[PDB]
Each structure stands twice: as structure tokens, then as C-alpha cells.
């Protein structure tokens with residue numbers, strides 16, 4: 001997160017860290033046994049780390065659970081990043097409490113101007129690499145489709161939306177990939193891609209989760 005602030009320990013209880021010996025992507029807990037992340041964060045040997053704040057210190061509240069299976073969306077296109085969503089099933093259910101909680105899936109899509117919370121342990125520099133120990137937060141609005149398509153002509157599909165600041169300075173970045181974009185208590189986006197981080201007129205692009213609720217529910221119900 002570039003230009004964001006320290007969230008405060010456990011204030012984002014649905015945030016998870018996907019770990020393979022180091023933090024590589026974020027994700028969102030949607031029930032006690034499933035996490036939603038981005039398809040491009042897929043890899044084998046994933047350990048999901050819940051209740052985290054400092055990812056380099058065991059401070060208490062952490063639950064480390066291995067992924068039993070990862071389900072990348074069948075129509076995921078790694079060249080356009082269209083359908084960039086993945087579901088991860090945990091080997092055992094997590095114990096939910098006030099520090100580890102699931103976030104709700106939306107019943108409708110959000111409108112331009114909605115203010116959302118984006119969080120993660122991704123890079124904090126737009127020019128260079130500085131990865132934080134604790135969770136960073138950024139409040140950012142969903143942009144209109146016209147401004148998004150004007151920024152990324154020919155690359156935005158109906159399963160994506162832009163959120164951020166066209167002036168640059170505040171944005172999600174590499175490492176935040178797979179994590180949550182929550183608006184009015186509902187998970188509306190997944191950090192997916194963007195050109196650089198916090199650059200002027202190059203906002204972040206997020207997977208539009210409201211277009212995948214029936215898919216998430218049918219897939220969870222059959223696995």
C-alpha cells in the first residue's frame with residue numbers, strides 16, 4: 001500500500017497472508033474454511049496465515065492453516081487477467097473470534113464514488129521496494145467506468161473496476177495482490193493489477209466480485 005496508514009492490530013479481521021516461506025499475496029476469509037484471493041497468486045505449498053498484524057513476529061492471535069486445495073476460476077486468462085479470482089479451501093476450519101472473522105459477499109455491485117478500504121503487506125514505495133512488517137490500510141473510492149477505460153483503454157473487461165486517486169501518491173501495489181477491497185462491509189474487489197504503483201492517471205484495477213457470487217457459492221457448495 002503506498003500512501004496508506006498502519007491499520008492497527010487485528011482491525012481488519014478478514015485479511016489473510018498467503019505464505020510459502022515469505023508473504024507473497026493477501027486474501028479474504030469468507031467463511032471458516034474458505035478464502036478468496038486472485039488467480040495469479042496461485043502456487044502449490046500455500047499456508048494461509050490468519051490473525052496477523054506483524055507477519056515477521058508471532059504476537060498471538062495467529063492461526064497458520066495449510067490450504068487443502070486452490071480453485072483458480074476455469075476462464076482465468078493470465079494474459080488479460082480477466083476472471084482473476086481463486087478460492088482456497090483450508091485443511092481445517094479456522095476458529096473465528098473478534099480478531100479472525102469472515103467478510104460478507106455483496107448482494108449488488110457498488111457504484112462509482114463508493115469509499116472502500118484496501119489493506120495489505122505489499123510494497124509501500126512507488127519507486128523502489130520497501131515491504132512493511134504490519135498491515136497497511138488505504139481508503140479509496142471506486143472510479144467511474146469511463147475514467148477507468150480512459151486510463152487503460154482496451155484492457156478493462158466487465159469483471160474489473162478501477163479504484164484510487166488519479167493524482168497518484170496513494171495506491172495498492174505488488175504484495176497487496178489477492179487482498180480485499182471492502183465497501184460498506186461487503187467484499188467488492190480483489191487487488192489485481194495496475195501500471196506501476198501510485199502513478200498519476202494509472203489507478204489500481206480490481207476483480208469485480210459482485211459478478212462472481214453465484215460462482216463462489218456453487219463452487220463452495222460442491223467442494
Ligand SMILES: C[C@H]1CCCC[C@@H]1Oc1cccc(-c2nc3cc(C(N)=[NH2+])c(F)cc3[nH]2)c1[O-]
Pocket residue numbers: 024025040041171172173174175177191192193194195196197198202203204205206
Ligand atoms: C505472480 C504473482 C506471484 C506471487 C507474488 C505476486 C505476483 O504478482 C504480481 C507481481 C508484480 C506486481 C503485481 C501487482 N502490481 C500491482 C499494482 C497495482 C496497482 N497499481 N494498484 C495493483 F492494484 C495490483 C498489482 N499487482 C502483482 O500482483
Ligand SMILES: [Ca+2]
Pocket residue numbers: 052053054055056057058059060062
Ligand atoms: Ca505475526
Ligand SMILES: [Cl-]
Pocket residue numbers: 149153154155
Ligand atoms: Cl475501451
